[PDB]
């Protein structure tokens, strides 16, 4: 399993006239896996800190707040809330 097709999708959405090497896709896959591990571990850590046995979007939001720096955290929070809001609406 790898995120290669999704990175192509995102790239063409962002840069139609740019291509990615195999090594750059390996790096991107490592990055995505690494970020998933960091965020999920911090969410679990939060759930245990607060004596919970479920990972809800609040835990994920505050995990993103802890991990990401100020402006990055703000933009990523906006993106996540937008996606969750539109998924709920649909």
């Amino acid at each position: 399993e790898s995120y290669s097709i999704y990175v192509y999708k995102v790239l063409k959405q962002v840069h139609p006239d740019t291509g990615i090497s195999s090594k750059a896709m390996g790096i991107m896959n490592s990055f995505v896996n690494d970020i998933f591990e960091r965020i999920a571990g911090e969410a679990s850590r939060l759930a245990h800190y607060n004596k919970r046995s479920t990972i809800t979007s609040r835990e994920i939001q505050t995990a993103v707040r802890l991990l990401l720096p100020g402006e990055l955290a703000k933009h990523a929070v906006s993106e996540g809330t937008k996606a969750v809001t539109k998924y709920t609406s649909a």
Binding site: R45, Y49, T62, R65, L66
Partner: protein
């Protein structure tokens, strides 16, 4: 309130750090560094507090925020 950290207190910390002679700008430099450190730690603590839906900042929040930075502290209930 950062001027409450007087020059003698910074001198005491430098002497416990083994410093023999101290320049004159070291005090402001130290106030800035401490403010940055405290800012980071308090940001993490307040994030923890808001997440736990509390209005009081506990020692556990500070301890987890220090564990987040890697500055593990013993002797406060960890």
């Amino acid at each position: 309130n950062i001027q409450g950290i007087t020059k003698p207190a910074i001198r005491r910390l430098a002497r416990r750090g083994g410093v023999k002679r101290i320049s004159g700008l070291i005090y402001e430099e130290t106030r800035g560094v401490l403010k940055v450190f405290l800012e980071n730690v308090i940001r993490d603590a307040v994030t923890y507090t808001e997440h736990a839906k509390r209005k009081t900042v506990t020692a556990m929040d500070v301890v987890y925020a220090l564990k987040r930075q890697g500055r593990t502290l013993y002797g406060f209930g960890g």
